[PDB]
Design an enzyme around this catalytic site. Structure first.
Site, mmCIF file in Angstrom:
data_model
loop_
_atom_site.group_PDB
_atom_site.id
_atom_site.type_symbol
_atom_site.label_atom_id
_atom_site.label_comp_id
_atom_site.label_asym_id
_atom_site.label_seq_id
_atom_site.Cartn_x
_atom_site.Cartn_y
_atom_site.Cartn_z
ATOM 1 C CE1 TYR A 108 -2.158 -3.784 1.757
ATOM 2 C CE2 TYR A 108 -3.531 -2.761 0.041
ATOM 3 C CZ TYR A 108 -3.288 -3.922 0.990
ATOM 4 O OH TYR A 108 -4.042 -5.102 0.615
ATOM 5 C CE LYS A 159 -10.362 0.662 4.138
ATOM 6 N NZ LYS A 159 -11.427 0.539 3.257
HETATM 7 N N1 LIG Z 1 -5.807 -11.010 -3.950
HETATM 8 C C1 LIG Z 1 -6.559 -11.166 -2.994
HETATM 9 O O1 LIG Z 1 -6.306 -11.618 -1.750
HETATM 10 C C2 LIG Z 1 -7.830 -9.919 -2.938
HETATM 11 C C3 LIG Z 1 -7.626 -8.861 -2.012
HETATM 12 N N2 LIG Z 1 -8.565 -8.112 -2.216
HETATM 13 C C4 LIG Z 1 -8.225 -6.821 -1.495
HETATM 14 O O2 LIG Z 1 -9.077 -6.663 -0.297
HETATM 15 C C5 LIG Z 1 -9.445 -5.164 -0.049
HETATM 16 C C6 LIG Z 1 -10.970 -5.130 -0.060
HETATM 17 O O3 LIG Z 1 -11.387 -4.236 0.962
HETATM 18 P P1 LIG Z 1 -12.793 -4.776 1.849
HETATM 19 O O4 LIG Z 1 -13.371 -5.765 0.978
HETATM 20 O O5 LIG Z 1 -13.354 -3.370 1.759
HETATM 21 O O6 LIG Z 1 -12.356 -5.014 3.232
HETATM 22 P P2 LIG Z 1 -13.209 -6.136 4.192
HETATM 23 O O7 LIG Z 1 -13.356 -7.399 3.946
HETATM 24 O O8 LIG Z 1 -12.693 -5.550 5.673
HETATM 25 O O9 LIG Z 1 -14.497 -5.542 3.950
HETATM 26 C C7 LIG Z 1 -15.453 -4.731 4.860
HETATM 27 C C8 LIG Z 1 -15.889 -3.374 4.457
HETATM 28 O O10 LIG Z 1 -16.888 -2.849 5.277
HETATM 29 C C9 LIG Z 1 -16.719 -1.604 5.745
HETATM 30 N N3 LIG Z 1 -16.935 -1.676 7.182
HETATM 31 C C10 LIG Z 1 -15.990 -1.695 8.179
HETATM 32 N N4 LIG Z 1 -16.589 -1.545 9.405
HETATM 33 C C11 LIG Z 1 -17.891 -1.441 9.139
HETATM 34 C C12 LIG Z 1 -18.899 -1.059 10.122
HETATM 35 N N5 LIG Z 1 -19.101 -1.172 11.561
HETATM 36 N N6 LIG Z 1 -20.254 -1.470 9.540
HETATM 37 C C13 LIG Z 1 -20.448 -1.322 8.374
HETATM 38 N N7 LIG Z 1 -19.373 -1.236 7.269
HETATM 39 C C14 LIG Z 1 -17.984 -1.397 7.765
HETATM 40 C C15 LIG Z 1 -15.473 -1.227 5.264
HETATM 41 O O11 LIG Z 1 -15.516 -0.293 4.765
HETATM 42 P P3 LIG Z 1 -15.809 1.403 5.190
HETATM 43 O O12 LIG Z 1 -14.296 1.923 5.315
HETATM 44 O O13 LIG Z 1 -16.471 2.027 4.152
HETATM 45 O O14 LIG Z 1 -16.337 1.116 6.747
HETATM 46 C C16 LIG Z 1 -14.656 -2.380 4.728
HETATM 47 O O15 LIG Z 1 -13.964 -1.805 3.506
HETATM 48 C C17 LIG Z 1 -8.709 -4.490 -1.237
HETATM 49 O O16 LIG Z 1 -7.336 -3.999 -0.626
HETATM 50 C C18 LIG Z 1 -8.660 -5.443 -2.153
HETATM 51 O O17 LIG Z 1 -7.657 -5.317 -3.282
HETATM 52 C C19 LIG Z 1 -9.504 -8.071 -2.745
HETATM 53 C C20 LIG Z 1 -9.919 -9.329 -3.490
HETATM 54 C C21 LIG Z 1 -9.095 -10.585 -3.646
#
Ligand SMILES: NC(=O)C1=CN([C@@H]2O[C@H](COP(=O)(O)OP(=O)(O)OC[C@H]3O[C@@H](n4cnc5c(N)ncnc54)[C@H](OP(=O)(O)O)[C@@H]3O)[C@@H](O)[C@H]2O)C=CC1
Length: 271
Positions: A50, A226
């Site tokens: 990152y 996160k």
């Molecule tokens: N190669 C791999 O292994 C893969 C990696 N990825 C990576 O994973 C990451 C994706 O992040 P993401 O899926 O968003 O992470 P998560 O699985 O942690 O998904 C949860 C999301 O919900 C939101 N959230 C957090 N707290 C709360 C709450 N209390 N109430 C409601 N919503 C909440 C967050 O966004 P917010 O900040 O809006 O709260 C968060 O982004 C990227 O970096 C992506 O590239 C994706 C696919 C495959």
């Protein structure tokens, strides 16, 4: 109620809850960290990828009290190239001796990842990192490195969340004293709105997320969720005010699918 911590075979100890720093951009990284710490967030975890280690190491100026995890990216693998990689992470992060250091992916076709683990066992025999471990390894891959160099990694971080529970790997893991960190622990938010979770969050007067964040807790899983919206932050972190039953636990266990993976298959992933 005060939080919990998970401990490692190498006798060090890591808070079972912490803050993920995925995506969150370099200059707001700085900001978001302090804001977070002030919430009572105890661990922080980013990765080299990152490129916000700089923002973390400023963000965490005069907060050594806190457990700091970081991940060696795929273009830095091998022996001499990893040691280099570490110093620099440690530099941008600014805590010469870090808490946890993870190999981001195996990349087994690249065949260079066992070289990468020796570099690690080194850094801990020096005592220039506190605790070493890996990210996205399999059975095949861990076995391979425990035989090669006689030291088990303390943690292997992996994809996992209600719809994917790698119980195979958590069987292997448990049988080698390995701690299992959840990656994408909400299945990217698919479960935010899943209807099994619309009953169990009602039940306990909470939101769908916390319900699940806790699932991770009540599995012995280091989990690193996160958010940025600090309302969520302190929400995610407020998961000790309750507990769940086996009616609950074995009801979120039905959510597991064989096809529930959503990201790179680390056996096959190419970057
Ligand atoms: N190669 C791999 O292994 C893969 C990696 N990825 C990576 O994973 C990451 C994706 O992040 P993401 O899926 O968003 O992470 P998560 O699985 O942690 O998904 C949860 C999301 O919900 C939101 N959230 C957090 N707290 C709360 C709450 N209390 N109430 C409601 N919503 C909440 C967050 O966004 P917010 O900040 O809006 O709260 C968060 O982004 C990227 O970096 C992506 O590239 C994706 C696919 C495959």
């Amino acid at each position: 109620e005060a939080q919990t911590v998970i401990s490692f075979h190498d006798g060090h100890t890591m808070p079972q809850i912490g803050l993920g720093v995925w995506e969150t951009p370099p200059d707001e990284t700085a900001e978001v960290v302090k804001e977070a710490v002030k919430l009572g967030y105890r661990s922080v975890a980013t990765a080299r990828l990152y490129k916000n280690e700089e923002g973390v190491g400023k963000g965490l100026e005069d907060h050594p009290e806190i457990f700091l995890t970081t991940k060696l990216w795929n273009d830095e693998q091998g022996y001499d190239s990893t040691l280099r990689a570490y110093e620099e992470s440690a530099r941008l992060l600014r805590r010469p001796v870090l808490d946890l250091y993870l190999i981001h992916w195996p990349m087994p076709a690249q065949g260079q990842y066992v070289e990468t683990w020796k570099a690690l066992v080194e850094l801990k025999k020096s005592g220039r990192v506190k605790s070493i471990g890996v990210s996205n390894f399999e059975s095949e891959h861990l076995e391979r490195i425990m035989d090669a160099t006689g030291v088990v990694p303390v943690v292997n971080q992996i994809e996992l969340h209600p719809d994917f529970q790698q119980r195979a790997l958590r069987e292997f893991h448990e049988k080698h004293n390995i701690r299992t960190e959840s990656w994408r622990p909400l299945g990217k938010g698919r479960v935010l709105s899943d209807e099994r979770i619309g009953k169990i969050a009602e039940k306990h007067s909470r939101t769908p997320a916390q319900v699940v964040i806790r699932w991770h807790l009540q599995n012995g899983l280091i989990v690193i969720p996160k958010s940025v919206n600090p309302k969520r932050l302190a929400e995610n972190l407020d998961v000790f005010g309750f507990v769940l039953d086996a009616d609950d636990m074995q009801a979120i266990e039905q959510m597991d699918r064989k096809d529930g993976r959503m990201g790179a298959d680390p056996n096959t992933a190419k970057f």
